[PDB]
Every structure is written in C-alpha cells, then in structure tokens.
Symmetry: C2
Subunit: 162 residues, 2 copies
Amino acid sequence: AYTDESGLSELVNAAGEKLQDLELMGQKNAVRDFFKELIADSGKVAYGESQVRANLEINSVDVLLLSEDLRAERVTTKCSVCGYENKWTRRWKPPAPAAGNCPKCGSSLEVTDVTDIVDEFSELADKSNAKVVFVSTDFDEGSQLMNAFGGIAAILRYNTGV
Amino acid sequence: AYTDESGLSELVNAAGEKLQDLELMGQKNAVRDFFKELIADSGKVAYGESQVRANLEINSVDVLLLSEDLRAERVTTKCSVCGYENKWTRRWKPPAPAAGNCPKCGSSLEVTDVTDIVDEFSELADKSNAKVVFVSGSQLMNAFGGIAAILRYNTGV
Ligand SMILES: [Zn+2]
Ligand SMILES: [Zn+2]
C-alpha cells in the first residue's frame, strides 16, 4: 500500500548492485593499468592537474583518471578593458572567488566563469575521445590516486615527454 | 575495457530512478496517512518507541513508520544467577554496553544481547504482518522521534 510488493524494486534493485561491483572492477583495473604503464616507464602516463591538463589540450589522453574526492574549481578571470586574462584552480570551501585589478592596465578584473575541475577535464576528455573513468576513495588504488597523484591521472596514447 | 557500453546500465540506473521516484511518493503517502489518523483519532495512530513497541507486541499496528536516520540499540542484561532481566535503549554513536551487578541477588549481570532498534521493531512487525515503511519525513524523525504507527484499531495503549 505504501511500498513495492510485486518485487520490481527487488528486481531493479538486484541489477543495480551487480553493476556497481562491475564499476569497481573497472575502476580498479584502470588505476592498475595506469600503474602498469607508469612502472614500465614508457612516458605514456601523466598525473596531477597541470600535467594532465596540457595533454588533454592536445588530444593525447587515451584514458583519464579522476578521484571521487576532487574538491576544487577552475577560476577564469578577464580584464574589463585590455586583453589580460588568467586561470587557476582553487580548492572550494563554504563564498565565491574575487577579482581585483589588472596588473597590466590597472582596470578592474572580473571572474567570467567558475567550473569544478572534474567538469573541465571531462569536457576536454570528451573532446579528444578520451575515455573518462572515476575512482572512489575506497580501495587503496583509488586512495593513492587522490593521495599521491593529485586525484587526477592519465594513460596516454603516445609519449609527449611532456 | 572499463565500463558498460551495452546501454544496460543506462536503463537500470534509470529504472532505479523511476522506482526511487515512486518509493518516495509512497513514503509521503504513509506519513500523510499517519498525520490524518492523528487528526479523526489520537488513539488509532501510536508514536514514540514506548507506545509503538507496546502496540506491535499486541499486533495492533496496521502500518509502522521508521525514520531512516534512527541510531539506537536495544540492550538486554540478564542475571547470571536469579531470573532477573532488564531491557534499556541507547542512542547510537561510534562501544558496547556493560551490565554490572544485580539489584536482586547481587550476582553479575551480563549484557546478553544488543539488537539494532530497527531490527527488533522489524521482527516485531513481521510476526503481526504490519506494513513497514522507512521515512527520511523529517517531521517524523523530529516531531515524533522517528517511530510512529497507524493502528488497526484503538487500543488505549
Ligand atoms: Zn587591463
Ligand atoms: Zn541476580
């Protein structure tokens, strides 16, 4: 009378849990494949916000790895008169990012967009047909991902050396 | 190599959304009906751990409401000697209770059981075939303590 009884909940419920376990199977093997590419050197890996960003901007990323714990936004700012601009990543916490003055012409800067980092990197991934994988902060692999590698890694299609 | 590109996920994950959509309307069905009973009869609903357990024990609960945000443990200490026994409830946090000695014979009391409140009340509800609903809504967890019941009849309990 107030909750399912025909047992479709239990059915739909069933598949759902199995799929999750498939997820973590994919998330594990993926971190591991990043590791296996890293060890074998190759120069076919990359990790950290700055290093992984530049590869995405040249479509070199085969597989993109992001921790389920990434708490950080990318802030773009632009000068209201001259062509000055800058971007940078700030860890989000409870107001909003500010815009001071132009170090070029002294005019007031203004923030033109804020985007969580996981957004920007998925937009670029999608762009270059990179595969997008997420990694919960549970299994050690997915833990180290955030601990060491800034919670952003990647297996590359080729060695940019970058 | 790392995901479900069969479309299977998309469907089930989505079907799991449609059915969660529904389960929630139902939980509003149940809380609304409890409050309506409370309004034509203050004796045909129950609320609170005390009145509700008393009513389930006597199989007079038509429908039972349990707040998902309920952290509590029912302790049972018996005397290792005389037939003494008590039952108290303890709000949940990160330990396990101890008994001490007996007010009757002075022997050692032992905690013979700890059972999740939701568990006991559930078993209690399975023997009378009462319909069990978990509510998260928060007017339950707060205004009444996350335990409430729509009786099948007025019990004076
Ligand atoms: Zn300027
Ligand atoms: Zn005793």
